[PDB]
């Protein structure tokens, strides 16, 4: 099981958001704290991805852009199965010390998108994905989102691409409803990512007005990379 083996490994630590919780809850508090977390971990995903096998292969162009694009994504995916396996999606397990209860999804004026989250959370008991299913589509996602204009080397993302579905098919194989039920789950990760993207892209825009701070290389990524999502440059590879 040497994939396996490696995708285990390399899977990223335990990161905390560093929020106060003895102050009373707060929009510009808990938000950027989310945004603090966020900028965390981005720098644990580029770690991740960079370990992950054949991910060189990329063009150097190619392989912060492909994280950069991803990075909502794969945040949330990872948070839905933290949420799982630690309070049974009872709450939204961003962190330790960012655990979002109904007041918080609430009081952070995200209700919408936490809920679909949640929802996101919930399945992976639904479906009872088990923890080596969980690290080949969370590796999946990486590789699932490209611009229209093409990629450096669009041909050697599109083999790395295939060569990870077949990992996901062999994981499988021990088959049909089982990729079908997994690639729809991978699917409904793509409009949450999108929300997200619209929301902190709004944030980011009156941060100022708001009182949310913005790392500078959050600042960077959802000013140069998302809004070519947003504006429709670069698009999500949907399964169905
Ligand atoms: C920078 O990303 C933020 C974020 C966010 C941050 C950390 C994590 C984690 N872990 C997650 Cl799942 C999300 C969805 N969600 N986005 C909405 C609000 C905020 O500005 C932004």
Redesign the pocket.
């Known amino acids: 099981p040497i994939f396996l083996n490696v995708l285990e490994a390399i899977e990223p630590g335990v ?1 905390c ?1 560093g929020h106060d919780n003895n102050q009373p809850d707060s929009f510009a508090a808990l ?1 950027s704290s ?2 603090e ?6 720098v644990h995903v580029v770690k991740w991805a960079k370990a992950l096998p054949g991910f060189r292969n990329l063009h150097v162009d190619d392989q912060m852009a492909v994280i950069q694009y991803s ?2 994504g794969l ?6 199965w ?1 949420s799982f396996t630690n309070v049974n999606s009872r709450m ?1 397990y ?2 330790p010390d ?1 655990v979002f209860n109904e007041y918080r999804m609430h009081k ?1 004026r ?1 209700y919408s ?1 936490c809920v679909r ?1 949640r929802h996101l959370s919930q399945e992976f008991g639904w479906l009872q994905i088990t923890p080596q299913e969980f690290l080949c589509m969370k590796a999946l996602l990486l590789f699932s989102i490209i611009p229209v204009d093409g990629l450096k080397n669009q041909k050697f993302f599109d083999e790395l691409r295939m060569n990870y579905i077949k990992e996901l098919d062999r994981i499988i194989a021990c088959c049909s409803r089982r990729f079908y039920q997994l690639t729809k789950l991978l699917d409904s990760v793509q409009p ?2 999108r929300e ?2 619209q ?2 892209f709004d ?2 825009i009156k941060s100022h007005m708001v009182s ?1 701070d ?1 790392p500078e290389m ?1 600042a960077e ?2 000013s140069v990379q998302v809004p070519k999502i947003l504006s429709g440059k670069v698009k999500p590879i949907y399964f169905h």
């Open positions: 990161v958001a938000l989310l945004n977390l966020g900028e965390r971990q981005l990075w909502m945040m949330v995916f990872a948070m839905g933290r939204l961003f962190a960012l952070s995200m998108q989250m949450i990512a997200l993207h929301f902190t944030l980011l949310v913005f959050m990524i959802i």
